[PDB]
Write a protein that holds these residues in place. Structure first.
Motif, short mmCIF file in Angstrom:
data_model
loop_
_atom_site.label_atom_id
_atom_site.label_comp_id
_atom_site.label_asym_id
_atom_site.label_seq_id
_atom_site.Cartn_x
_atom_site.Cartn_y
_atom_site.Cartn_z
N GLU A 23 0.77 -1.24 0.00
CA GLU A 23 0.00 0.00 0.00
C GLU A 23 0.81 1.29 0.00
O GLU A 23 0.31 2.34 -0.41
CB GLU A 23 -0.94 0.02 1.20
CG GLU A 23 -2.17 -0.84 1.02
CD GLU A 23 -2.93 -1.05 2.32
OE1 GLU A 23 -3.25 -0.04 2.99
OE2 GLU A 23 -3.21 -2.22 2.65
N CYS A 24 2.05 1.22 0.46
CA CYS A 24 2.87 2.42 0.52
C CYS A 24 2.90 3.20 -0.79
O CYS A 24 3.06 2.61 -1.86
CB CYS A 24 4.30 2.06 0.91
SG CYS A 24 5.31 3.50 1.15
N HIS A 25 2.74 4.51 -0.69
CA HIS A 25 2.74 5.39 -1.86
C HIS A 25 4.14 5.92 -2.21
O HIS A 25 4.32 6.51 -3.27
CB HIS A 25 1.81 6.59 -1.62
CG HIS A 25 0.38 6.22 -1.36
ND1 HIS A 25 -0.45 5.73 -2.34
CD2 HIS A 25 -0.35 6.27 -0.22
CE1 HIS A 25 -1.64 5.47 -1.81
NE2 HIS A 25 -1.60 5.79 -0.53
N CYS A 26 5.12 5.70 -1.34
CA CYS A 26 6.46 6.25 -1.59
C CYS A 26 7.08 5.85 -2.93
O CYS A 26 6.69 4.85 -3.54
CB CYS A 26 7.40 5.91 -0.43
SG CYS A 26 8.34 4.37 -0.58
N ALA A 27 8.04 6.65 -3.38
CA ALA A 27 8.73 6.43 -4.64
C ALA A 27 9.42 5.07 -4.71
O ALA A 27 9.42 4.41 -5.74
CB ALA A 27 9.75 7.56 -4.86
N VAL A 28 10.00 4.64 -3.59
CA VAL A 28 10.69 3.37 -3.55
C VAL A 28 9.78 2.20 -3.89
O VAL A 28 10.14 1.31 -4.66
CB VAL A 28 11.31 3.11 -2.16
CG1 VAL A 28 12.07 1.78 -2.15
CG2 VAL A 28 12.21 4.27 -1.78
N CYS A 29 8.59 2.19 -3.29
CA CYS A 29 7.64 1.11 -3.52
C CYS A 29 7.02 1.17 -4.92
O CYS A 29 6.47 0.19 -5.40
CB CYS A 29 6.56 1.13 -2.44
SG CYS A 29 7.19 0.57 -0.82
N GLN A 30 7.10 2.32 -5.57
CA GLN A 30 6.58 2.43 -6.92
C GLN A 30 7.62 1.92 -7.91
O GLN A 30 7.28 1.37 -8.95
CB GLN A 30 6.23 3.89 -7.23
N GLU A 79 14.22 6.06 2.82
CA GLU A 79 13.15 6.83 2.21
C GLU A 79 11.80 6.15 2.47
O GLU A 79 10.83 6.81 2.85
CB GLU A 79 13.36 6.99 0.71
CG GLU A 79 12.18 7.70 0.05
CD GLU A 79 12.45 8.14 -1.39
OE1 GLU A 79 13.53 7.83 -1.95
OE2 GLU A 79 11.56 8.81 -1.95
N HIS A 80 11.73 4.84 2.25
CA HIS A 80 10.47 4.13 2.48
C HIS A 80 10.04 4.23 3.94
O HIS A 80 8.87 4.52 4.24
CB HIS A 80 10.58 2.65 2.12
CG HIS A 80 9.50 1.82 2.75
ND1 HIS A 80 8.21 1.80 2.27
CD2 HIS A 80 9.49 1.11 3.90
CE1 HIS A 80 7.45 1.12 3.11
NE2 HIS A 80 8.20 0.69 4.11
N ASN A 81 10.97 3.96 4.86
CA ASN A 81 10.65 4.01 6.28
C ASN A 81 10.13 5.39 6.69
O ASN A 81 9.09 5.47 7.34
CB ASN A 81 11.87 3.62 7.13
CG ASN A 81 11.95 2.11 7.35
OD1 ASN A 81 11.09 1.36 6.89
ND2 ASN A 81 12.99 1.67 8.07
ZN LIG Z 1 7.35 2.57 0.38
#
Ligand SMILES: [Zn+2]
Ligand SMILES: COc1ccc(CCc2c3nc[nH]c3cc3c(=O)[nH]c(N)nc23)cc1
Ligand SMILES: COc1ccc(CCc2c3nc[nH]c3cc3c(=O)[nH]c(N)nc23)cc1
Ligand SMILES: [Zn+2]
Lengths: 367, 367
Positions: free
Chosen positions: B302-309, B333-335
């Motif tokens: 579910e994370c919206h951060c750039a890393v997860c994308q 960054e994700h954390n």
């Molecule tokens: Zn993330």
């Protein structure tokens, strides 16, 4: 876009400027290829590497085959998808690294066996690069240690030339690869003209998409290297890209281009960046030196990179001396960007017929 | 925009959500303040920290006074300009760090002397924070070690309350500071209600822009901490921001907000990130574990951060196990982003009167 197409737009003396077209994108030459050892250009996000100006990056086959492994990367979708870089990627064959950063090795006409237990050969190297999804594939060779006798150098060059034949056939055996990637041959022969000519002829005989000048950047010093390049480059087919492996200091690059080189790769930008060395038009500087503690100016007064627009030498001085990761990030981004600006200046001056003058002005101020 | 203005937009039980207005910007509360020890939020560019969602960041006075030095930073233009963050910055007083990561120390009613040779006092701490250009200034206190007897705790709390008086006057002695920054008082008293009430009354008596609950997050365990917060927070003026120092695990944050806390800071996000621990709505996960080697999914579904994308667990797994800096960057960054998304969910659920339900759903899935 074609599998591989190299066209020269302009020339000035032996220097050339142009483009290499490949399915994944266009590579402007002379080109500098940022290096990444473990599926990453150290301390840089792919977008950052690209923002710096790079059209292609170098992949480390040696480390990649050991971890996370070639098969693994292929299962995950390939190097491009794995590290997030959709543009061209060149991979070295892995031989150089083995005889260098490896515990013990076993040489044989078949290939090489190293514990750091693995058996790397022309065929295996080519398959590993394929599994990684490499765009520009380097033939598997043997990098003759410097210095070397004419006999040992010829003997080695002869094996490389045989291994190049096997690399060529192995590469053509894979439809997908032969159809979407390119194969570069590597010239050997140490510092001997007659040997460089023989290596050159044998390679041309086999036929490759590009030719690399190997065996240099092994501790011979700039004078010696340039001397070898003087008579070596001309022997390579003129209509194909010329790649000088491992050469990266700014002055070496300018000198190599004056001698016909079209592609470069070097660890200095990134490595020096983490060590605290930043490149500038006024020569390298070690940001850790006390003189920069309160210097509000950017790393370089002319650099266009994001780092020089945002942070001061003083701040970076602080970060590096404090062992902060951000320090490593900023220094690396600036260094990589600097190298790309050097390449842009090289390409522009050549297209404009003022390269020889640029080279002069560059050295005068750099040194 | 005013020097300092805290307004509560909504409440649900003891939980509150609102905003703190300051000259450098708006801070949405409950807020999480990413921490940076040496003038940098480890492995993150300021823009990246901000893209994550942070409205304010924490500054490390202790390290900063030692290097590059408070005076130095002031000469270079202040912390904001130095590290490239133009938004609000909160700085701790430095006392906590001294009695922790310092060789030997010398305590006295005047302040403290530490070799790691320096003499830090209420007045000096306040001046250092001023030179750094801090927006939210923490009074200089003494963090009572846990566990502590009623006598030792009262004795300590009493000194802190005296030091808070000096911090208050010292702060008001500087026109520029008193006019552009805010001062937060710190409540002490260990785990004793009568002492927490006395500290609270003394602080309120002096008057501050905000009140921090200090003395917790010193190894008392969540149950004990929550028990103390139950009767401690209510004692603080309701119309001012409540800051729980050093508390950051997601579950601690949710629990603390249910008890009236408005601000948080914690090293876990960044530290855990480099250690290989990533936070998810399904609980923390250690990305180095073999189970993630070929996991193509992002850190969190579910994370919206750039890393997860952009990158997979597998890739990050590789980077961290390979000791690559990029690994440290992506995990951090994700954390940080995860923590900010937690805060956004907290603020939204409170504004909508469904926080208690959110807290339940959060724990159920997180654990
Ligand atoms: Zn993330
Ligand atoms: C970790 O990522 C990489 C780092 C370096 C390289 C280039 C390695 C290299 C040489 N370097 C200097 N002289 C060289 C010479 C050679 C050479 O003659 N052959 C080969 N195959 N490689 C050489 C490729 C990838
Ligand atoms: C390196 O950057 C920073 C890291 C941590 C902090 C918070 C430090 C801290 C506490 N931490 C846990 N319990 C605490 C308790 C306290 C406390 O009671 N007083 C103070 N002044 N500080 C405390 C501030 C800046
Ligand atoms: Zn720059």
């Amino acid at each position: 876009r074609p599998r591989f197409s190299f066209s020269i737009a302009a020339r000035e003396g032996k220097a050339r400027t142009g483009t290499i077209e490949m399915k994944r994108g266009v590579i402007r030459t002379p080109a500098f290829m940022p290096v990444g050892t473990a599926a990453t250009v150290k301390a840089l996000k792919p977008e950052t590497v690209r923002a710096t100006g790079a059209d292609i990056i170098l992949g480390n086959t040696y480390h990649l085959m050991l971890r996370p492994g070639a098969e693994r990367i292929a299962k995950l979708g390939g190097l491009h998808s794995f590290m997030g870089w959709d543009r061209p990627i060149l991979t070295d064959s892995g031989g150089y690294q083995v005889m260098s950063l490896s515990s013990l090795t076993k040489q044989s006409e078949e290939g090489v066996t190293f514990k750091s237990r693995h058996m790397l050969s022309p065929e295996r190297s080519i398959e590993i690069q394929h599994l990684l999804g490499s765009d520009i594939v380097m033939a598997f060779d043997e990098c003759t240690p410097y210095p070397a006798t004419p006999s040992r150098a010829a003997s080695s060059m002869e094996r490389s030339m045989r291994w190049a034949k096997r690399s060529r056939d192995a590469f053509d055996s894979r439809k997908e690869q032969a159809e979407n990637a390119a194969l570069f041959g590597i010239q050997q022969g140490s510092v001997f003209e007659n040997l460089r000519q023989q290596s050159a002829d044998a390679l041309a005989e086999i036929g490759f998409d590009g030719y690399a000048v190997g065996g240099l950047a092994v501790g011979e010093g700039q004078d010696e290297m340039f001397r070898v390049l003087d008579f070596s480059v001309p022997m390579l087919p003129d209509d194909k890209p010329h790649y000088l492996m491992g050469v990266g200091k700014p002055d070496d690059i300018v000198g190599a281009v004056e001698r016909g080189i079209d592609m470069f790769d070097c660890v200095l930008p990134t490595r020096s960046g983490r060590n605290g060395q930043a490149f500038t038009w006024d020569g390298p500087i070690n940001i850790r030196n006390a003189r920069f503690s309160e210097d509000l100016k950017p790393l370089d007064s002319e650099c266009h990179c994001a780092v020089c627009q945002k942070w001061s030498r003083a701040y970076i001085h602080h970060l590096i001396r404090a062992g902060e990761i951000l320090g490593a990030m900023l220094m690396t981004e600036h260094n990589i960007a600097f190298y790309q600006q050097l390449m842009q200046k090289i390409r522009d001056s050549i297209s404009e017929g003022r390269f020889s003058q640029f080279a002069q002005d560059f050295r005068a101020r750099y040194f």
